[model samples]
Target: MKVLYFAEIKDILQKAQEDIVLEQALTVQQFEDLLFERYPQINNKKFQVAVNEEFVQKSDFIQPNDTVALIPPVSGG
Candidate 1:
């Protein structure tokens, strides 16, 4: 699957996107846990997960080829 990183997530991960191998389709929570397990540094960051360009809940199931993105909260004043 292809995972995209936005805002600080890109800098933290040192990449704009990554291709990962998740043998089986899993829920968003599982995917999140996998990411944090591999990159604990991002665990504490505030962000939301979007699958296929649409925001999804943690319980949503992610298919094998789904495009996942990490979108950080944006603020400006």
Candidate 2:
């Protein structure tokens, strides 16, 4: 799977994009858990996700071909 990080999220993850192979299917929450497991410091940060360019809630399912993007919390309007 391809994961894209936007704005501060990229800085947090220390990369803008990465190709990762997950062992199994996961919901958005599970995905978040996986990421947080890797980067524990980011656990308290506000984050959102887009799967294939569509905003997805935590319960949303993630499939093999899904393109995931992380949207970090932003300041200013």
Candidate 3:
């Protein structure tokens, strides 16, 4: 799986994206759980979950090769 981070999420991770190898496939909720576990600092942050460039719910299934992105609120310039 390829996970993307943008805005504040990007800053917190110190990277733009990650090519994650899914040892197993799972739902969006599971994916988020893992992510939060890995990055404890971002656990309480508000962000939207997107898959394949489309917004998704926690129940959305994520395949190993799917693209996932963490989108924080955007600020108007």
Candidate 1, RMSD to the unseen true structure: 1.5
- The runs of at least 3 residues in candidate 3 whose Cα sits more than 4 Å from the true structure, single-residue gaps closed, are none
Residue 52 error for model 1, in Å?
0.4
- Index of the highest-lDDT prediction: 1
Per-residue lDDT of candidate 1, residues 13-65 (tens digit): 99999998778899999999999999999999999999999999999999989
Question: What's the lDDT of the predicted structure labeled candidate 3?
Answer: 0.91
Judging by TM-score, tell me the better candidate of 1 and 3. Answer: 1
Selected candidate, larger lDDT, 1 vs 3:
1
Q: Please give, for residues 19-65, the per-residue lDDT of candidate 2 as tens digits.
A: 88876778999889888998897788887899999989999888876
Cα error, candidate 2, residue 17 (Å):
0.9
Candidate achieving the largest TM-score: 1
TM-score of each prediction: 0.92, 0.85, 0.91
lDDT of 1 at 11: 95
lDDT for predicted candidate 1 compared with the true structure: 0.93
| Residue ranges of candidate 2 with Cα displaced over 4 Å | 74-77
Q: In candidate 1, list every pair of residues with a backbone clash.
A: none
